[PDB]
Write a protein that binds this ligand. Structure first.
Ligand SMILES: Nc1nc2c(ncn2[C@@H]2O[C@H](COP(=O)(O)OP(=O)(O)O)[C@@H](O)[C@H]2O)c(=O)[nH]1
Ligand SMILES: [Mg+2]
Ligand SMILES: [Mg+2]
Ligand SMILES: [Mg+2]
Ligand SMILES: [Mg+2]
Ligand SMILES: [Mg+2]
Ligand SMILES: [Mg+2]
Ligand SMILES: [Mg+2]
Ligand SMILES: [Mg+2]
Length: 140
RNA sequence: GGUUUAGAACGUCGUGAGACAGUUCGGUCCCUAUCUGCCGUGGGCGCUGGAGAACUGAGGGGGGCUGCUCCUAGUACGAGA
């Protein structure tokens, strides 16, 4: 009945400053987990997370988009864990979306630009995740 | 085509012939280039015995325009846009 065991579930968010690479990382995650047959790119509007017309045209994520992927590993090490990822908007003008998601999620991948690193909205999502007391990993 | 000839009519002015930075219809645009100039093209002589070819380069002319798409690069800049 249960397609995957309880232990093999990973509810995570991808949170960061604007244009830190959240949607691109989500697209590569979907590609390497096989659900997406083309990598696409955000600035051409081919990103799957940026499904709304405004997101496609303006190159930004305005909504928290939740999807699910199956990951075994680089070397197929593990039985397929199911990662429930949510791509959140790093805009300070959409903070309720990230707070909304981050309440329910169990982990956060905080993305940081290698050049800019910690930025204002990275600090904002940091505070939100801290008040929700969630575990974090970081992706530079 | 307009502008200003000769015809005709409207409005207005005048008694009238006629007239109007008023309008309307119709109304003949000539020249075989001597010289200069210019574009090409040769004949004569010269360049120091004659001739055939290859050049040199003074000097002169020609040409010089620019959009859009992509990469750099969603890069620099920008809280973002
Ligand atoms: N050069 C480069 N561009 C990236 C990288 N990650 C994302 N981008 C581009 O940077 C822009 C913003 O990244 P995006 O994935 O949309 O991030 P988000 O807006 O923070 O969710 C897009 O044009 C991406 O294609 C990266 O690691 N290197
Ligand atoms: Mg994005
Ligand atoms: Mg952008
Ligand atoms: Mg006559
Ligand atoms: Mg008359
Ligand atoms: Mg010259
Ligand atoms: Mg010249
Ligand atoms: Mg581009
Ligand atoms: Mg704008």
């Amino acid at each position: 009945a249960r397609t995957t065991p309880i232990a093999r579930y990973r509810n995570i968010g991808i949170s960061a400053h604007i244009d830190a690479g959240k949607t691109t990382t989500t697209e590569r995650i979907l590609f390497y987990t096989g659900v997406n047959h083309k990598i696409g790119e955000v600035h051409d509007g081919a990103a799957t997370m940026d499904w709304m017309e405004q997101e496609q045209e303006r190159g930004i994520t305005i909504t928290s988009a939740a999807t699910t992927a199956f990951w075994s590993g680089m070397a197929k090490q593990y039985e397929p864990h199911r990662i429930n990822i949510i791509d959140t908007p790093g805009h300070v003008d959409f903070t309720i979306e990230v707070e909304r998601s981050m309440r329910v999620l169990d982990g956060a991948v905080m993305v940081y630009c290698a050049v800019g690193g910690v930025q204002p909205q990275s600090e904002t999502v940091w505070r939100q995740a801290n008040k929700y007391k969630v575990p974090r990993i970081a992706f530079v």
